Design a protein around this ligand. Structure first.
Ligand SMILES: O=P(O)(O)O[C@H]1O[C@H](CO)[C@@H](O)[C@H](O)[C@H]1O
Ligand SMILES: [Mg+2]
Length: 448
């Protein structure tokens, strides 16, 4: 077989059987042979095993003659930012993001923080690691510790006009991951009052693993917003490359609507720019991008596809409905910090609540949310769906699975590249009843 920890976009596995210090060291050796010239940035998250896995990575990199730049405990986006900012050959973030306690992993990038994925180097690394029985060499290169976050913080702050910000009251929920460190370093430069929930980094995760999609974790943010009269609330996953928004009523905002909202926010600063979006939910983004003077660019979902499309298009912003937001000026990379700064600025400047900024969009393009199906035969299930709707002659698009546009409603149905699942998204033109009947109809067909 092959090493299970090597996935489509990253490395992730249970410690110590699927990922351990020996494997991490061998990954460092193999990575050194895949990169162009230069040093390698290393960072890690709050998980208990992350520092030791980073040290083993560093040992393998330095045995292969790579200088290492240790940026310490950080978010994934800080590895992306520093890899690009320091003109490094590449970077590795040690993180399991939102996964259980016994899991860890790595996200690997090359120059300019360009992703290393299964077909762009990661499986080559896997195959090298799988066959490597060489004795570990000794270091022929040095490690320097570079924990200064000043350039990163200045970059985050550059997205907003600080003189226009109002002293909004914001709930922030790090979930005992790493986001609270950055919030606290940004706070002296912002007028906001923060209400800090689950703020201290703790890799034991006493309040649950950092996954703001779990309703129990969602509710801690919502309750803090409502009980404190906060303008809005923000929650992050453990490595804070995803952020999640709660309006002043405590309502969790479906990530679809943030794409159009952030696109409009960015297009105010970068007029006429291109905006990359995924095919799962589209109508609202296309309309909001066009009405702000931007050009929407459809792209298959998946961060590596999004980033490569943004680069080819000089796109100013890309967004996925799955709480991933990418910014050209940020090495084309995703940040869980830039989005809430932009939203706080939009609320401050417009005088509108986050709820009202999205309410009419949610009414105009209601959506199912992503619904996941584990079925006995995904291919046969998809065929049952398409056969049922054939007589209606939908307009079909194969950018990312199957998209079917029926006029007043549409759906996307695709296999996940990170899990053995089918994922369904449905939206309609202002018709909640049609949304429900079609969603239920498709669901019955998938489960047939
Ligand atoms: O499993 P999927 O749906 O193929 O991919 C999922 O993880 C990717 C990396 O986080 C994201 O870029 C996708 O938007 C998300 O849907
Ligand atoms: Mg994450």
């Amino acid at each position: 077989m092959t090493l299970p920890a090597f996935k489509a976009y990253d490395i992730r596995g249970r410690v110590p059987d699927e990922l351990n210090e020996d494997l991490a060291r061998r990954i460092g050796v193999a990575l050194a042979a895949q990169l162009d010239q230069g040093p390698v940035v290393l960072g890690h998250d709050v998980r208990l095993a992350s520092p030791a896995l980073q040290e083993a990575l560093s040992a393998g990199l330095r045995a292969s003659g790579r200088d290492v730049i240790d940026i310490g405990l950080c978010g994934t986006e800080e590895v992306y930012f520093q890899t690009d900012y320091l003109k490094a050959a590449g970077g590795v973030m040690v993180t399991a993001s939102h996964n259980p306690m016994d899991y860890n992993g790595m996200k690997l990038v090359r120059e300019q923080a360009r992703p290393i994925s299964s077909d762009t180097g990661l499986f080559a690394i896997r195959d090298t690691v799988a066959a490597d029985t060489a004795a570990p060499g000794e270091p022929t290169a040095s490690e320097q510790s570079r924990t200064d976050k000043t350039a990163y913080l200045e970059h985050l702050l550059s997205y907003v006009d600080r003189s226009t910000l109002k002293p909004l009251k914001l709930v922030v929920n790090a979930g005992n991951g790493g986001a609270g460190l950055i919030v606290d370093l940004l706070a002296p430069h912002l007028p906001f009052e923060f209400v800090r929930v689950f703020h201290e980094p703790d890799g034991n995760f006493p309040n649950g693993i950092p996954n703001p999609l779990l309703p129990e974790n969602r509710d801690a943010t919502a309750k803090a917003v409502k009980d404190n009269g906060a303008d809005f609330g923000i929650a992050w996953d453990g490595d804070f490359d995803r952020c999640f928004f709660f309006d002043h009523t405590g309502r969790f905002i479906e990530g679809y609507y943030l794409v159009g909202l952030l696109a409009q926010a960015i297009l105010a600063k970068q007029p006429g720019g291109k905006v990359v979006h995924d095919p799962r939910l589209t109508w609202n983004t296309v309309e909001q991008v066009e009405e702000a003077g931007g050009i929407p660019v459809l792209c298959k979902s998946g961060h590596a596809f999004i980033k490569e499309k943004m680069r080819s298009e000089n796109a100013v912003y890309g967004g996925e409905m799955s709480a991933h937001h990418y910014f050209r000026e940020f090495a084309y990379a995703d940040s869980g910090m830039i989005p809430w700064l932009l939203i706080a600025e939009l609320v401050s400047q417009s005088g509108r609540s986050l709820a009202d900024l999205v309410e009419a969009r949610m009414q105009k393009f209601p959506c199912s949310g992503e619904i996941n199906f584990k079925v006995a035969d995904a291919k046969a299930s998809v065929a049952r769906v398409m056969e049922h709707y054939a007589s209606l002659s939908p307009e079909l698009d194969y950018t990312d699975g199957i998209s079917a546009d029926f006029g007043q409603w549409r759906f996307n149905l695709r296999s996940s590249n990170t899990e053995p699942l089918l994922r369904l998204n449905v939206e309609t033109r202002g018709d909640a009843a049609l949304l429900e009947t079609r969603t239920q109809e498709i669901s019955n067909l998938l489960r047939g």
